[PDB]
Write a protein that binds this DNA or RNA. Structure first.
Lengths: 507, 528, 23, 209
DNA sequence: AAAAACTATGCATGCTCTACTGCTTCTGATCTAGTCGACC
DNA sequence: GACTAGATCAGAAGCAGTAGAGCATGCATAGTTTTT
């Protein structure tokens, strides 16, 4: 998957879109605006390089590159930003609805052929490489062209042409007083027609909930950290790639700005002599270290040479039983090794055979790892990882090797001498009961980084000038109330059985 | 703070000079070990006193020399902070002597020096390392007195020999050294005395205190008794709002980096003052306007839109957390936590608060319960009020020596990458062949790094990489010493023993030739 | 195909964080 | 800043800089002069400006040296949020004290405040379960209360004015109660107030006893 | 003579600059095949 | 003859990940001084 993702929001501007069957319920236009704003925010937070566009049809005023009547292109395909979100929010409220009506209008004829044509033209206008061309239609009318059959045929032909071109269309049907029937007219326009999605829908589309569910996690496309060579022998070599299936998430770095006008400021670092003031070339300077009363002078090239043993790659040592790999011997986050085949042919078969045999024999390949040039070598273990998929045949553990760094002797630290004290069976049983009372199921994605979420919410509030930032819910808190409620008296029994009567575990 | 005193007894007898062709002499190995020890001690900038006494020298320099006793014993250097002078003496101007000497006399003089010099200074760990060949006569009449003095003074003792308790021999090559039957009667006699004195000093564990030069060159054993202990982090493990156990956490495993940092200096003067670093902020305009640092403000990118974010505003709106929190979020089956997802750059070992019995028994009960139920504790960790909160897993670790919790950080949702990789088992194009599978099986069997000892039906690791010291520090120390002693000379190449210790035993290499050739012939690999 | 995120094509819709849910 | 968004709140948290309502700039443009700040315009006060305003302006919008106009008084009054600490008796006493001190008894209304009023709207005197609602007496009492009279429901010894309608059956009981009480209340009729409303003055009771 | 308060320090976190190395994608230069206009 | 458009390649900008040096600083332990 290479390229960007392009999205166009087609929002109907007919009269029916401004009427609500019930009272105190947001109108379909307001719901579409909210969903578009949520998608904009999600794109900004996750992947800001994508392109989003907003086009309104059925209005009176028109703004298109083809001058088509009753079609307004509010925002062309461009990277999302705060200005676009504010422009969309301008029409969010009822006052915003009236402002939209005055600015563009409503209750005007339209043709799906023209809107599809302008959407295709907008897609063509883009100059980058798009990995996904998508259109979303926000409307509450299931029979846009019933009076005229020629318009329906033209719309069907345009939809088919867009489908062949490679444009994926979705219909975000909204609430309709009489119910929405996709099979009536839109069955032939949707890119993929689901068998279940054939009955008359008397409520909102389920996709609206998904769109409104904001996501505040950066999304990174698959990328190889480094393509290296695994050398079983001097004359035997295969090509593999290393990926970081788990990587720490850091907030975007701060940017220096000119306080007077809030514009980027270029930062320049210069080195000059204290006696002359002229610029110093890298050869002019030297690296020195002081040890007591002795000084040692080394050049940059010599310092780089100091940490250099072997060329980058993985040198395969002998295999070791997995029982000898201690679980508590953790130094650095593990990596994933997968065959590449883009540099040397036939490596995939050897990798597969090695993985199968390692799984059968329950062994791990010990190797010497050197990520980059002039980097000291380290010891790693490649543990086989068999492909595992959960329900619905969806991969959850890719097949390959798990690269685990084995700490050196210097990495380990000795612990202070301690005296072992054992607990009587009654205390062990009481603590087992306490533990069982708090049993729960753990998943890798059961927690949210409170700092990152709070920073993202504060940034969004500042960008949109909201009344107050949305306070995040810290799922990392222990919520001691539930623990107290579940444990009941067990804590008191454990305390009176273990802790002497006069302990005061507070100082 | 923490200080130690170390005495190095060096054998310079004629027997040390003697060597077999193709085998480095014991004197060279002892010199290398001492050089490595002094390198680490001096370049680490640690305050520990080091003294060197040579026994077997032609001359005599010893307070107890008078009286026609302890002859041919010289005290090269008394207790003082290590300096480059000691390394220079070791490298060049310390040659073997033709006069034999008794190692017991060397130990006696070392103890006398320790007692005499340790009057005006405070020490908490005295260690004496004895390097001999045990190929000289000795008197056993003084064994009782020296043992009693060692017991009274609380002085640790270590012994290094050219042999340990048939391809080419290598220094630290994870292979046999000093093949059997090459030991004479004198060293056989010395073995029992050294073993029994070590047993009396420590007991059965003392048998592990007798290392070898080759073994010590790749085991970091010389610093075992001199290494310090990391500070303790005290906190309270809380399961609810009432239960709480006082605990202390140490860093069981942490990546070690060079403490000293390279300093940039001007070549002409070789001084820090000459080089000055300045930062200038300018606008992006033709005029190249310059703006003061105070004028600069902090901001963030919001998808092509720059939103100002002042540092004071960020501090005011920054997420606030309570520092020094170790709370048990819940308990989950150990199978639900996988080593793949472990994050962070450290592992914590949590014990009960020192000098505490109730906390000790409570922690032991919790550890035993977790082990019996096969469960781990998902907990919240925070070093202080400024450290970002973390979600980690604590699991039991029970050993005959001690029982403690082991804590490793766990990843957040934002820290997980979802990558899709094509399956290999279902790939017909890359499907292997039965002969290829057999060849790979043979290769794996040949290159096994663990041996099954049938005497105890156990597994012994032939290549314990965990015990190998980091080679980067040794290389840095060697290069620094070479530059200091030889200002005008290119840096030397990597020492052979370093490569030998970083390479697997020659046995597996020799036993994997035929399987490797089979793999090469059966697997057609063409570079692209 | 099923479960694919409607916002970021090619990425499965991450399940919302559930924190701790005692059994 | 005319809108209290997140940035304005953050600036409020830091008392280094002030905040001024946008109308200040408009007013400055209109008069083409650098009119100084007033508490009405600004929403935040720095310590220096806070100290400066104390000497010139009170804790509220009103100032000391510069007079106050109708608009200024309205703005100052709108500043106060709420005040419900007193009780009806205390408020009445304070009102009467103010009227006496400033001789504000000449106003068309509030002239009945000093006198408590009773009606014969109960079939049995001093009973709360026999209301005679549905007659002119109720509207007469409501008018008296609106004008400022304190309508009291319990025939306390402090009652000073009693109104009796066309029914004179219980005049003897009222006279007996007046005699018993230490302080005597003059007997009055419903027509007296009806005639006096137009004059907006206390007509002599000798003609309506 | 004994207990409490202030200062030295020191080790560990997180941020920040600063650089280095790798991969992905956009822009520009060059080569080759096809096309149009004029004539005959 | 002139021009276009597709393709092919190479160079370079942007982004991600890591290592090294410096630094504010927060909690805690050891040394010194003040008070009764």
């Amino acid at each position: 998957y290479s390229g960007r993702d392009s999205l166009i929001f087609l929002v109907d501007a007919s009269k029916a879109m401004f009427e609500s069957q019930s009272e105190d319920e947001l109108t379909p236009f307001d719901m579409s605006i909210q969903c578009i704003q949520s998608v904009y925010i999600s794109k900004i937070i996750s992947s800001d390089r994508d392109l989003l566009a907003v086009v309104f049809y059925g209005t009176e005023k028109d703004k298109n590159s083809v001058n088509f009547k009753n079609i307004y292109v509010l925002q062309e395909l461009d990277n999302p930003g705060a200005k676009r979100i504010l422009e969309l929010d301008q029409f969010k409220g009822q006052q915003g609805q009236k402002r939209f009506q005055d600015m563009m209008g409503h209750g005007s004829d339209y043709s799906l052929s023209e809107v599809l044509w302008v959407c295709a033209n907008l897609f063509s206008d883009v100059q980058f490489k798009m990995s996904h061309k998508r259109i979303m239609l926000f409307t509450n009318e299931d029979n846009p062209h019933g009076n005229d059959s020629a318009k329906a045929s033209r719309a069907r032909t345009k939809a088919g042409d867009l489908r062949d071109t490679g444009i994926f269309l979705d219909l975000m049907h909204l609430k309709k007083p009489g119910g929405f029937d996709i099979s009536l007219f839109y069955r032939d326009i949707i890119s993929i027609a689901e068998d279940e999605d054939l009955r008359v829908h008397f409520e909102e589309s389920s996709k609206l909930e998904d769109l409104l569910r904001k996501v505040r996690a950066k999304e990174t496309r698959k990328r190889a950290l480094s393509r290296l060579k695994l050398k079983l022998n001097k004359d035997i070599v295969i090509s593999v790639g290393i990926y970081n299936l788990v990587q720490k998430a850091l907030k975007p770095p701060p940017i220096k700005l000119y306080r007077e006008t809030n514009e980027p400021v270029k930062t320049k670092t210069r080195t000059f002599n204290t006696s002359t003031g002229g610029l110093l070339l890298p050869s002019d300077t030297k690296r020195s270290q002081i040890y007591g009363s002795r000084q040692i002078i080394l050049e940059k090239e010599e310092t780089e040479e100091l940490k250099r043993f072997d060329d980058p790659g993985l040198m395969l040592m002998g295999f070791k039983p997995l029982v000898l790999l201690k679980k508590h011997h953790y130094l650095r986050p593990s990596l994933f090794v997968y065959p590449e085949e883009s540099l040397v042919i036939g490596s995939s078969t050897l990798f597969s055979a090695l993985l199968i045999k390692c799984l059968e024999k329950e062994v791990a390949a010990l190797c010497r790892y050197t990520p980059r040039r002039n980097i000291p070598p380290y010891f790693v273990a490649l543990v086989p990882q068999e492909e595992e998929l959960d329900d619905q045949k969806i991969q959850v553990t890719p097949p390959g090797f798990q690269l685990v760094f084995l700490p050196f002797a210097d990495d380990k630290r000795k612990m202070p001498f301690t005296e072992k004290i054992m607990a009587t069976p009654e205390q062990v049983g009481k603590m087992k009961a306490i533990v069982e009372k708090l049993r729960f199921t753990y998943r890798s994605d059961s927690f949210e980084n409170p700092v990152l979420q709070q920073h993202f919410r504060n940034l969004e509030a500042l960008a949109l000038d909201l009344m107050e930032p949305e306070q995040a819910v810290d799922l990392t808190l222990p919520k001691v109330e539930a623990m107290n409620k579940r444990l009941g008296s067990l804590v008191d029994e454990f305390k009176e059985l273990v802790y002497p009567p006069d302990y005061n575990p507070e100082g | 703070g923490n200080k130690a005193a170390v005495v190095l007894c060096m054998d310079v007898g004629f027997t040390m000079s003697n060597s077999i062709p193709g085998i480095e002499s014991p004197f060279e190995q002892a010199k290398k070990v001492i050089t490595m020890f002094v390198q680490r001690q001096v370049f680490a900038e640690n305050k520990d006193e080091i003294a060197l006494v040579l026994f077997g020298t032609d001359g005599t320099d010893n307070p107890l020399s008078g009286g026609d006793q302890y002859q041919n014993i010289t005290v090269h250097r008394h207790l003082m902070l290590p300096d480059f002078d000691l390394l220079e003496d070791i490298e060049s101007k310390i040659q073997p002597g033709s006069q034999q000497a008794d190692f017991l006399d060397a130990l006696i003089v070392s103890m006398d020096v320790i007692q005499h010099e340790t009057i005006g200074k405070k020490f908490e760990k005295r260690h004496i390392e004895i390097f001999t060949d045990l190929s000289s006569r000795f008197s056993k009449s003084q064994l009782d007195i020296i043992i009693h003095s060692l017991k009274k003074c609380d002085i640790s003792l270590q012994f290094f020999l050219p042999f340990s308790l048939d391809g080419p021999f290598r220094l630290g090559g994870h292979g046999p050294s000093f093949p059997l039957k090459g030991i004479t009667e004198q060293q056989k006699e010395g073995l029992e005395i050294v073993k029994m004195v070590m047993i009396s000093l420590e007991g059965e564990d003392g048998l592990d205190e007798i290392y070898s030069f080759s073994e010590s060159l790749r085991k970091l054993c010389v610093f075992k008794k001199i290494e310090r202990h990391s500070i303790h982090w005290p906190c309270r493990l809380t399961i609810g709002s009432n239960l709480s156990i006082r605990i202390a956490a140490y860093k069981s495993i942490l990546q070690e980096r060079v403490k000293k940092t390279w300093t940039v200096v001007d070549a002409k003067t070789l001084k820090k003052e000459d080089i000055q670093k300045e930062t200038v902020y300018c606008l992006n305009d033709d005029d190249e306007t310059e703006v003061l640092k105070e004028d600069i403000i902090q901001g963030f990118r919001y998808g092509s839109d720059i939103v100002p974010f002042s540092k004071v505003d960020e501090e005011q709106m920054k997420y606030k957390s309570e520092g020094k929190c170790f709370s048990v979020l819940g308990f989950c089956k150990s199978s639900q936590v996988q080593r793949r997802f472990f994050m962070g750059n450290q592992v914590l070992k949590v014990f009960a608060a020192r000098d505490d019995e109730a906390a000790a028994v409570a922690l032991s009960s919790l550890i035993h319960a977790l082990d019996d139920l096969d469960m781990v504790a998902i907990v919240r960790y925070a070093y202080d009020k400024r450290a970002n909160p973390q979600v980690g897993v604590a699991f039991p670790h029970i050993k005959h020596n001690y029982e403690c919790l082991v804590y490793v950080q766990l990843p957040f949702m934002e820290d997980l990458r979802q990558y899709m990789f094509s399956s290999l088992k279902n790939s017909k194009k890359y499907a292997p062949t039965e002969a290829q599978l057999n060849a790979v099986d043979a290769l794996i069997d040949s290159m096994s790094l663990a041996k099954k000892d049938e005497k105890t039906d156990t597994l012994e690791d032939l290549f314990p990489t965990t015990k190998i010291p980091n080679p980067r520090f040794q290389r840095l120390f060697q290069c620094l010493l070479h530059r200091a002693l030889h200002p005008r000379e290119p840096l030397p190449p990597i020492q052979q023993h370093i490569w030998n210790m970083l390479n697997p035993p020659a046995e597996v290499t020799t036993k994997s030739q035929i399987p490797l050739s089979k793999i090469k012939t059966l697997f057609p690999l063409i570079e692209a | 195909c099923p479960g694919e995120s409607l916002i970021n094509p090619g990425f499965k819709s991450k399940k919302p964080a559930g924190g701790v849910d005692f059994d | 800043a005319g809108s209290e968004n997140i940035r304005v709140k953050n600036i409020i948290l830091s008392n280094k800089h002030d905040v001024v309502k946008p109308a200040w700039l408009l007013e400055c443009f209109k008069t083409k002069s650098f009119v100084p700040w007033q508490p009405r315009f600004m929403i935040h006060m720095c310590p220096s400006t806070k100290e400066h305003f104390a000497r010139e302006y009170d804790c509220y919008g009103d100032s000391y040296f510069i007079d106050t106009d109708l608009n200024q008084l309205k703005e100052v009054f709108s500043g106060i949020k709420n005040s419900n600490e007193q009780t009806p008796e205390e408020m009445a006493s304070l009102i009467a004290d103010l009227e006496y001190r400033y001789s504000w008894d000449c106003s068309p209304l509030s002239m009945f405040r000093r006198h408590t009023v009773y009606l014969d709207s109960y079939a049995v005197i001093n009973d709360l379960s026999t209301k005679n609602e549905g007659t002119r007496l109720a509207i007469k009492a409501l008018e008296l209360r609106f004008h400022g009279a304190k309508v009291v429901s319990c025939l306390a010894e402090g009652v000073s004015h009693v109104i009796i309608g066309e029914d004179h059956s219980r005049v003897a009981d009222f006279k007996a109660f007046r005699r018993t009480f230490k302080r005597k209340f003059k007997i009055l009729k419903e027509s007296w107030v009806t005639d006096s409303i137009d004059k907006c003055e206390l007509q002599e009771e000798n003609q309506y006893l």
